[PDB]
Amino acid sequence: MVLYFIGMGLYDERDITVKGLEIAKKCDYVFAEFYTSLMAGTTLGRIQKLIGKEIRVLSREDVELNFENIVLPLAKENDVAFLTPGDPLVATTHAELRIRAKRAGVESYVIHAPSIYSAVGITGLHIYKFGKSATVAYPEGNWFPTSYYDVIKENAERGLHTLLFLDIKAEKRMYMTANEAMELLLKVEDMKKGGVFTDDTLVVVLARAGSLNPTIRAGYVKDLIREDFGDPPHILIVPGKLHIVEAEYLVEIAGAPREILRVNV
């Protein structure tokens, strides 16, 4: 009787750690969700094939309202695994599920996997220089989210980089592109006018991290806002003050304008 929170990683079924795979293979029941992120390089079939078990996919409602009714009951008499994209506890509310497990007398263990949060390292930006992170959320009806704009501003004043997770509506199959995130940010800039995000702002786009050929691009909003970065998932990053080697990397690897090599100390 035990519950394992196992991350499947960034892009495909092979992004799971060996630890996670060997443990999953031996579990009596295997559950999973695919609404907290998008694994663009795999399918349930390949995952099931790899694990050798039938996987039951849970919806956000199943998890958020019925985890203790669907999963925990089985964990009391068996070994259960709950799979999620990337790392199970990063930018999700799955951590709270460990409390529910506890209160049900079920021991839980966490098996990490590569996460988008650390994969930003591939952009060449020093990961220790990232500040507070935020999520660019799709406006809905008359409600237009904007706090993420304030995060960029706060980080920028401190010279820190800003990681922007992009919205996702799995059931509607909606995956926010970096382009849409940029459009929303310009609209918020027009609203607040803090000179935080404009056509001249340098940004970095990372798409489908985890694949052998992710899309890594850096440049000014005016030039990237309409560029095709390939299929989702995408994340947008607004760098703060750059170190020379960061700029060098963005130019050499992410095709940024050579002019950014000239940093303003």
Ligand X SMILES: Nc1ncnc2c1ncn2[C@@H]1O[C@H](CSCC[C@H](N)C(=O)O)[C@@H](O)[C@H]1O
Annotated binding site for S-adenosyl-L-methionine: 10, 87, 90, 115-116, 166, 209, 234
Closer to Na ion by CB, 5 or 165: give it: 165
Compute the Cα dihedral for 72, 44, 113, 149 and give only its sign.
negative
Question: Which is closer to a second copy, CB of 225 or CB of 254?
Answer: 254
State which amino acid sits at residue 222.
K
Minimum gap (Å) between residue 103 Cβ and a second copy: 8
Chain-centre distance for alpha carbon 198: 24
210 lies in the binding site for ligand X (CB under 6 A): yes
* In the block, residue with structure tokens 């293979």: 25
Q: How far is CA 22 from CA 4, 44, 52, in A?
A: 12, 18, 11
Work out whether 166 is an interface residue with ligand X (CB under 6 A).
yes
- Please report whether residue 165 would count as binding ligand X according to CB under 6 A: yes
Q: Which is nearer to ligand X, 4 or 11 (CB)?
A: 11
2 binds, among ligand X, a second copy, Na ion, none (CB under 5 to 8 A by kind): none
Angle at 202 between CA 240 and CA 132, to 5 degrees: 35
- Written as six digits, the tokens of 173 are 């199959």
x/- map, 20-59, ligand X, by CB under 6 A: ----------------xx----------------------
Residue pair 97/63 in contact by the 8 Å Cβ criterion: yes
- From the list 179, 181, 225, 174, the residue with the least C-alpha distance to 200 is 225
Interface segment toward ligand X; rule CB under 6 A; list 52-60, 98-106, 110-118, 153-161: 110-118
Q: Which tokens hold the place of 227?
A: 């560029």
Which amino acid is present at 191?
Answer: M
Q: Answer yes or no whether residue 235 interacts with ligand X by CB under 6 A.
A: yes
Considering the rule CB under 6 A, would residue 90 count as an interface residue with ligand X?
Answer: yes
Beta carbon of residue 16, minimum distance to a second copy (angstroms, whole number): 6
Residue type at position 119: A
Mode of pairing for the β-strands spanning 79-84 and 55-57? unpaired
Q: 162 vs 225, which CB is nearer to a second copy?
A: 162
Q: Which parts of this chain interact with ligand X (CB under 6 A)?
A: 10-11, 36-37, 85-87, 90-92, 115-118, 165-166, 168, 206-210, 233-235
